[PDB]
Paper text:
It forms a tetramer in solution in both the absence and presence of bound DNA, recognizes a longer target than FokI (5′-CACCTGC-3′), and cleaves each strand of bound DNA much closer to the bound target site (4 and 8 bases downstream, respectively). The enzyme displays a similar tetrameric organization of target recognition domains in the absence or presence of bound substrate, with a significant repositioning of endonuclease domains in a trapped DNA-bound complex that is poised to deliver the first of a series of double-strand breaks.
In that structure, the asymmetric unit corresponds to an enzyme dimer, with a larger tetrameric assemblage generated via the application of a two-fold crystallographic symmetry axis, forming a dimer-of-dimers. In the crystallographic model, four target recognition domains (TRD) and four endonuclease (EN) domains form a starburst-like structure. Each dimer pair within the enzyme tetramer contacts the other both through contacts between the sequestered EN domains and through additional contacts between the TRDs. This locks the catalytic domain against the interior of the tetramer and prevents it from cleaving nonspecific DNA duplexes. The resulting data set extended to 2.5 Å resolution and corresponded to a primitive tetragonal space group (P43211) in which two copies of the protein subunit occupied the asymmetric unit. The designation of the enzyme assemblage as a tetramer agrees with (i) the solution behavior of the protein when analyzed and purified via size exclusion chromatography, and (ii) the same structure determined independently via single-particle cryogenic electron microscopy (CryoEM). 3D variability analysis of the CryoEM DNA-free apo-enzyme tetramer map shows an oscillation between either side of the dimer pair, with correlated motions of each TRD affecting the corresponding orientation of its neighbor.
Residue numbers in the entry:
A (entry chain B), C (entry chain B): 3 to 265, 272 to 308, 312 to 322, 333 to 459, 467 to 510
B (entry chain A), D (entry chain A): 2 to 163, 168 to 327, 333 to 459, 469 to 510
The structure:
């Protein structure tokens, strides 16, 4: 909705203010030579109380970062939002963040001095100096930087000096928008995993699935005491989330046929559709991978030794652990699964759409996922930045980036495209501070995602426009979920 | 999803195309006309209470004949309950005097696999009115300029229930707001007067100043001065609201003063009303100022000894011909504009009471800083986008323009300073004309009585299109971020 | 909520008006000697478009009834409700009802003449004379008859003369409140059936359950061609609802152990808890029923002939068909299942409460069912009538019905209770017209239901009060479901 | 479920009992007092903006010392988000000046198994304020007069953060509305004046009639007459709203007229204000009528030649001692009543602006027939039931009464005409006194400064209890059907 983007706009402005004035987050003593700041979303793997954003402060010469959790309040929430924010800021410090920033309207109808009030309470009662307060006047949504010059610091913060272990700089997200690990998971996999969780919630007495005798025999050799299901699904707990993982993994991905190592490579296909609908995905085989290489490995290794190979090429156990981490991460980031593991209303809704309209590759399913990526994945923020920056360039000069064609007439080329994408990128990293550094790659993950979901056109670029955004499609995504 | 009204407009356009492709959808075999064209438009507020989602007008080889079909559109979000509403709504529309009615409803719901057949069956079994058609639709393609093209099928045709005019009615799907006379503040003050009078219909009456009452009695010896100076004859609720609003807020005692006379010299008083201009710069003016120099022209003809003071009063109340409107003519035209806009914004009932939306507008003006506040401007913009149907208009312009420039980004341009292409004012007029031809001949969402000035000025003022009127590769630059805010508001 | 009870109050008043004036539903010709009218809920087995109520008109000497479907509108719905009502009235006639009655506010803020408007449209366009229009002024909720004298007929109806086949008088409900068939179904059964429907919606490829070899062999003799599962679950379609029935029946009630006829009686128990939580319920055995009687029947009948007996004592097939009809009826009446068979939001919610708070016998589960019976089962109407009638009797004379005790002091006895219950009953049948005729039984089903759910106290009666209603408990039930 | 406020009251009562059973919940080992009693009450509107769900007052063996704990109650319906709100709310309460704060939150949520431990941990780790206690609860038993008895456990105690008064503050959980001076119409007109002034703070000022301005100048030669006759000195927003409301609606020019003099004869004018009486019979009266015969007493002392006209004006503005309130004394007491009720109904901000609820009340009066309409009466009744906390009061009376009569239906009765039991006025006073002893000593929801007249009259007038004051076997007969409507309204 509107709230997610506005928090992103304010987080960008906070990051800019700390770069302009490091004394907002540092005491007079310990002022560093150079600090950089950048805003990002909060990774779902962090604790329950979710922040509106994170601002990372990096120091010159170090490899560590100090992270500030951001809480953003709108007037529509009313003055009750102030007391929510104070509690949330204490929650963010309890979670382990070096600081927290409360960003709230400069005045309300009821209250002339809301930020002064929040500052007073923090000063009088809390005694935590790691919580900053910022107040704002209404943002300019025509700008690339809607909150530029419209946010003042009413209370600075100081990072708690009793911090011996500092956060690594390469940790955490580097953009405000969510990067999906674009290889292992699919729309169909989210659908089936939620389906298994709905199945297990209705029949907790469900019998564990049975492995083939050759597989169960092989597990006996490598892990003589271990339970074979726990072994090949790489689980140790019996919690709800791990059990659903077990059924999902053995039912949908590592099916009996896929767990067949050789026939020679068997050419097995899983039961999980690729997003492109052409076929079902493949696990451990297809090129010269595990099954095909082990077939070649048997030119000499024994037949029994092949099972040890199956369980820098990931085996069944290693892939099961990484794939579990992916689907767990993504489902939480999309807010489709509770921390406890039950499906949320949104997770149930996506599952319902898939069940009603022909599965995870249906238009209704693709459209609901896209709407989730726009709101919950914060691609609305990203689209706003690309739009306002592009409009600013092209309103000034509609022929920007074009190159002389045969007659001298301008044409927007692939070189034009790459120059324009690089300008957008340095603008996002240096001016807006909405992304950080850890090539025709600049925005490949974002643009492929956006194009696949219909938010940017199959034509990658057009003269006078840049990335041709299907804004009506984005408008529709913004409207969903009531 | 998109806007409910916009989806209704997309369906009305597709229905109008379907009637042109197959006139047997609304005509019996013997009733086949020589040539039939159809177009979709909004329903005028002046029509009955049960408001239709749209109107489709059918013209034949006849010269002055038009046949109107009232359209009701249902969304799955309304649920299976909407189907029964639509049957009742369709009967309401025929009762209002429409020749036919069309129900446009989803092909399936989660609850019910066969909704349109249900409506056809119920109409066949019980209603016995053959003037109601049923159309079923699959989800629209919002990528297209014509989202329902080929996605709507007729499940039940209609037959026209047996004088009619063709030059009558609105000619666009989007509403034309009457430019020049009314403002947000006027809508607000008028709704406040109607709410005050609704609670206290008896006690108040306005007081004219004595010189004016003496002047009216000499101009119109028998007429009641209030009825005279407000140009009213009825005693209906809506008329009394007008009388109070006119004298309380616009033709106030100061504004009704034709001239100031000091020591043989006549001068226009410089009166200002109590109604803010939309731009917030000052209060608005009547009979004086930059639009109407009536008082200044009268004072100059008194100072030159061309006219008596008695003749001056005649000119003030009666106007000066060419061009300069008098009090009575201004009151009557102002009453007609403000009545029309308030009904079309659906802020007022036919009875004259504020609607829920009029109440919501009034409350925003009262609490958040008046009719020129950001909250009031946002509420009006949302109303124009939704109730005025500019969401459908913006979609048409966007898709039609994207279709041109995606194929050729230099479309319409002309050789400029370096020889380089330039999108000029000529380019704009060529592009606007192509948009007109598509809107009337391909989409069938407008008909002939060239510019789009009224629409674009309104959209520009509420921030939905850019302050620059055109850009190369784009045409009219639409601010969809602003459009999102208006769509989400829910009036 | 408030709407359900108000429709019941208006339906009672409509039934009273037709008794006072049969010309409201009969033309001048064909005026009958004597007609009686009574209001009831609409049985869930009737079509999708559900009426707010039914009013039954019975004629003297006949065994047939003419039924009027009632649609009630509130001002809070606004004038849009009028056009809804016209369409609904046409829907009710299409469903096969002899007449329909639209009951709407006498005026709205917007509209001075709403009932005149509805009458005009019906007259001008519809041409159906079987639809009546009634208008009302605000009801008096202190009265036993809140709409008494406050409803006028703006448009009468006439029953379509082209009706050769008349509805039987013994058909349909005889009360405004829902009677649950108080023997075969339980809270646990609704819970498990919804659970099976949630299971099957997630895995439609689910394998059919397997019968014991002796059972499958026996089915081969009685129904040589029939599929044994379809045979013992007594199903013929393959629709969603019938399949969920099959899994539910074989998983939960006719389990493998319960399907064991003999060991002698086996003493099998099902997997469905009784509402009292003491044990699981029993099917076909326990007294001298099917299993025990067939054991006695084998004193002579063959062992093979016993299977024919198993499949006026209902067998497996006969009980499966009647029990299916019960659970189908009740779930639809509670609005927990769509006509298509998918669980509704309320059905899912009840299932969720049972899953989260310890099952169908939990307080949260009992409380949600009770809240459903108060609103969806319309026991709010019934409680209002008992309350206002009782208060009227006892406010007049607080010692009403008491009998002289040892000292002459009044005591409210069991005879006092039965006299008071009978007065309430004739008042409900003769004055309010909210129940019909097809003993210490007067309200046994309603009171047992109400007491079990905590709406009336375990003490059945008290002096000065009558049925002691726990009105605070009813208030809480009225508030749920947002 | 029940009402959110009622559940908060049930928890405050149980907290107060828990402190009496274990004073170590709020006192350090060295801070153990001689004897401690605790009671729950509402928080007075005169306290700061962040309003608590309740107050628990602790009295020690000290004579004038009271220690107040601000209570915040969270429901599962508020979700895991309410936990963080409560931490912030608790800090707000200590900042307001309370000695301690208590968070009362569910033992589990669907999302989170261990909510109260979360709050304890966060407070321990970051806040560093030991004056905030955390209590966890299992679902309440609404069958009981004490629904949380034994169902609330202390997860974190508090220690009182280091003058204090004991005779201060409200003495009941339910709010006492000040009877006699204000009406629904007064609340409505006052909110309208504040909304008008909020939009136009500059332009308006009220005009006193000339005789009164001359009289004030002679009585108070230096004082500004408006400040004098409205008994104000400040220029705050709330004060200006008072001045306009007083002169526009109550002490109108007619009502400010002390006498009418015709041919040597003095008479009370028979003025009526512009504020309706609650019963709708007439407009209300000031200084005249059935409550105050001040004008009649002055006119009778003029006619008897006991006093001058100058002395008559002194008596009118200054009152007559016994008993008869003058203009200034009436203005000051009326201002204090209306300010208190509006703040306690939460219809006005401390700043003087209408709240969302004040706006909702005003809109209902404006659109649905004024402050005495069924919709306005229903909105007020819902406010008293919810914001005034009479839902908890009714639950206490109901359960306490049911407990008595279920054991003995003839409880309190006395031998009547036939020898048969009768529930008499003596029975009622005995039963009311037992209710008092339970409310103060068992439930701890009221404390000593006998009748319940203020509460019962209010409840009776809004239809929540019966017009007959008592009935055998019942006590006070409660109309739970009416109570349902009020609970469902959501202000």
């Amino acid at each position: 909705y509107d709230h997610n983007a506005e928090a992103d706009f304010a987080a960008s402005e906070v990051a800019r203010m700390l770069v302009a004035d490091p004394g907002l987050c540092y005491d007079a003593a310990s002022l560093p030579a150079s600090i950089s700041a950048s805003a990002s979303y909060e990774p779902s793997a962090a604790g329950w109380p979710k922040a509106d954003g994170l601002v990372s402060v990096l120091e010159g010469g170090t490899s560590t970062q100090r992270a500030i959790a951001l809480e953003y309040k709108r007037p529509q929430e009313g003055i009750h939002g102030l007391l929510t924010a104070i509690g949330q800021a204490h929650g963010y410090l309890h979670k382990g963040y070096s600081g927290a920033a409360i960003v709230i309207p400069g005045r309300y109808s009821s209250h002339p001095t809301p930020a002064e009030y929040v500052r007073d309470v923090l000063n009088a009662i809390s005694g935590s100096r790691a919580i900053a307060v910022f107040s704002y006047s209404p943002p300019d949504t025509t700008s690339p930087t809607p909150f530029a010059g419209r946010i003042q610091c009413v209370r600075p913060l100081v990072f708690d000096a009793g911090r011996v272990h500092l956060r690594p700089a390469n940790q955490g997200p580097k953009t405000q928008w969510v990067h999906m690990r674009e290889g292992s998971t699919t729309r169909d996999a989210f659908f089936r995993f939620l389906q298994v969780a709905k199945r297990l919630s209705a029949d907790p007495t469900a019998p564990r699935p049975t492995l083939r005798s050759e597989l169960v025999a092989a597990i006996g050799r490598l892990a003589p005491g271990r339970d074979p299901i726990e072994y090949i699904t790489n689980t140790a707990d019996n919690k709800f989330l791990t059990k659903v993982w077990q059924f999902f993994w053995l039912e949908w991905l590592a099916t009996p046929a896929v767990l067949t190592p050789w026939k020679s490579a068997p050419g097995a296909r899983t039961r999980i559709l690729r997003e492109d609908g052409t076929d079902f995905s493949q696990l451990w085989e297809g090129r010269v991978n595990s099954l095909k290489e082990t077939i070649a490995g048997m030119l000499n290794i024994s037949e029994a030794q092949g099972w040890e190979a199956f369980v820098d090429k990931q085996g069944v156990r290693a892939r099961a652990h990484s794939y579990r981490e992916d689907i767990d991460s993504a489902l939480a980031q999309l807010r489709w699964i509770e921390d406890d593991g039950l499906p949320t209303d949104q997770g149930y809704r996506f599952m319902t759409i898939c069940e009603r309209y022909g599965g995870a590759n249906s238009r209704a399913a693709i459209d609901y996922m896209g709407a989730t990526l726009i709101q919950t994945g914060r691609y609305a923020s990203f689209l706003h930045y690309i739009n306002r920056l592009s409009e600013r360039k092209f309103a000034e000069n509609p022929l920007a980036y074009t190159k002389p064609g045969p007659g001298g007439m301008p044409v927007f080329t692939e070189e034009s495209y790459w120059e324009y994408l690089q300008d957008l990128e340095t603008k996002l990293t240096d001016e807006l501070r909405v992304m950080r550094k850890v090539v025709r790659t600049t925005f490949q993950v974002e643009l492929t995602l956006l194009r696949n979901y219909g938010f940017v056109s199959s034509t990658r670029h057009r003269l006078g426009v840049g990335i041709p955004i299907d804004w009506e499609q984005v408008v529709q995504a913004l409207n969903v979920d009531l």
